[PDB]
Amino acid sequence: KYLKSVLRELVTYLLFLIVLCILTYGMMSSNVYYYTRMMSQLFLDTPVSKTEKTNFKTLSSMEDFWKFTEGSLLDGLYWKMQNRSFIFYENLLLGVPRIRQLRVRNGSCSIPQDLRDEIKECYDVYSVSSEDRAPFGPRNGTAWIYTSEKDLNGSSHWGIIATYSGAGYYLDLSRTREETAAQVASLKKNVWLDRGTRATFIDFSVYNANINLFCVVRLLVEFPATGGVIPSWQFQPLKLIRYVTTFDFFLAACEIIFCFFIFYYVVEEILEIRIHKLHYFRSFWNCLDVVIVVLSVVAIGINIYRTSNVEVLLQFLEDQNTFPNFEHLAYWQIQFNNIAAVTVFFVWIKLFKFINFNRTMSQLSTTMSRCAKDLFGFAIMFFIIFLAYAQLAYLVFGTQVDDFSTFQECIFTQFRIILGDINFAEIEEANRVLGPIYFTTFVFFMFFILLNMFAAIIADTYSEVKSDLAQQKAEM
């Protein structure tokens, strides 16, 4: 035996690895990149007007946003056809773009009594417990009346400053440029962006009927309570009419095959628990074989949930003069790509289970298996001092650099210091006593004394392993 058992589980795994490769080949095409790039270089790179240089990426005031809304925005959405408006003469703008704002209410924080004669009013930072819900200005339409999240069919966004809800004051722009511009001018005249505003969303979607691939676009502008403007963007190439070409039928067949494979792998792994070895996990080849199954189950459930309800597309196709609410699908597509990309990584890592075909591949794995116990002990000691530097940098420089503004950024900056990437031209500006001292001590202690021990140990281990084999050859 041992060739009808340790090889059958390899041939059944090679087919799995081929089906997974076929499934991950069809997800990422080559036109998707240019489709996103052309749209990205249309709203974020053109200057707001011919006489200025700023674009959406470098907005720095509430007047720049107004210049962008009437200007570089309307020049991209509406194109005179050689009535609908194809963007690049292929990208059909379906529906109408929608704009929305979220604002806080007056008198929302506490003014110290000492200087209350100067501070007339304040507006607190954004929070669900301090969000305005009352009409303001002329109470004509839906742009001056608080509409809840339930009847907006909205959802949270998790922006940069905070996490904004799906309610607020919204307005659906028109279908032709000459009246959308009038609506924007009316919004600008009767001041719609007061100081109490905290967020603004502009969103739409396009089709590009040549290939079969939608594209939803959302642009966010955040106004922190400490003044300023922070822009953000998101372009997502959805696809909702999949079953058209024969290749789509082939992909459907290959994914039913994947479902069958995951069923087989879950049953033949349950069979090895109670009908066989009980409660032995510390092998790293069964702890990994469970992660793949769980991730695949999650990714299958997400995929079924995503394509089980496309009713928003049907509603839009019923009447094509409204706003297509494609925001939900664009989120689950990202959440599904984030899972289907991690499963492939672990499936590829699983190939190490079968590379022992000669007497020189066995010791190269024995070395790692015998130095993975000693490296783990030193890793904790390394990463404790790593975090000790990270938190000190966060507390000292994390106010005037922006390379240490948040703790994660502090960690990534040190990882980039290890690569020798960042230059310390501005570190000393935030502080001079601890400016160059921090850099020098960090480099010295973690690039000449602590980063080596990871090498030495490994080297030593390798040596003994070789002996621990060579002597065994001398015995025979």
What tokens were used for 366?
Answer: 């024995």
Binding-site string for a second copy from residue 160 to residue 179, where x marks contact by CB under 8 A and - marks none: -x------------------
For the four alpha carbons of 118, 123, 124 and 130, in that order, the dihedral sign comes to: positive
* Contact positions with a second copy (CB under 8 A) in 123-162: 123-125, 161
Binding-site string for a second copy from residue 354 to residue 393, where x marks contact by CB under 8 A and - marks none: ----------------------------------------
353 contact partners, CB below 8 Å, separation of at least 6 = 285
Q: DSSP string spanning 107-167?
A: S-S---GGGTTT-----PPP-GGGB--S--S---STTSS-B-STTTT------SSS---S-
Task: Give which of a second copy, ligand NAG, none residue 349 binds (C-beta under 5 to 8 Å, depending on kind).
Answer: none
User: What CA–CA distance (Å, rounded) separates 406 from 399?
Assistant: 9
- Minimum distance, C-beta of residue 81 to ligand NAG, in the bound complex (Å): 13
14 annotated ligand binder:
no
Q: Is 220 helix (H, G, I), strand (E, B) or coil?
A: strand
Task: Give which of ligand NAG, a second copy, none residue 106 binds (C-beta under 5 to 8 Å, depending on kind).
Answer: ligand NAG
Q: Which is nearer to a second copy, 229 or 375 (CB)?
A: 229
Interface residue list for ligand NAG (CB under 6 A)? 106-107, 120-121, 138, 140, 151-153, 190
Choices 68-76, 121-129, 149-157, 467-475; region in contact with a second copy by CB under 8 A = 121-129
| Secondary structure element (H or E) that encloses residue 334, with its range | helix 327-349
* Closest of 265, 234, 242, 364 to residue 9, by C-alpha: 265
385 contact partners, CB below 8 Å, separation of at least 6 = 445, 446, 450
335 annotated ligand binder:
yes
What per-residue string of b and e applies to 240-268 under the rule 16 or more CB within 10 Å gives b?
eeeeeeeeeeebeebbebbeebbeebbee
* Contact positions with a second copy (CB under 8 A) in 19-48: 30-31, 34-35, 38
Task: Give which of ligand NAG, a second copy, none residue 152 binds (C-beta under 5 to 8 Å, depending on kind).
Answer: ligand NAG
For tokens 């081929």, what's the residue?
Answer: 18
CA 298 to chain centre: 18
Q: Which is nearer to a second copy, 208 or 461 (CB)?
A: 208
Sheet holding 215-222, edge to edge: 169-172, 98-103, 197-206, 215-222, 230-236
Q: Which is nearer to ligand NAG, 153 or 309 (CB)?
A: 153
Task: Give which of ligand NAG, a second copy, none residue 311 binds (C-beta under 5 to 8 Å, depending on kind).
Answer: none
Q: Which is nearer to a second copy, 320 or 365 (CB)?
A: 320
Binding-site string for a second copy from residue 217 to residue 256, where x marks contact by CB under 8 A and - marks none: -------xxxxx------------x--xx-----------
Per CB under 8 A, residues contacting a second copy are 30-31, 34-35, 38, 84, 87-92, 94, 109-112, 114-115, 118-119, 122-125, 161, 195, 207-212, 224-228, 241, 244-245, 317, 320
Write out the binding residues for cholesterol: 335
Write out the binding residues for Ca(2+): 419
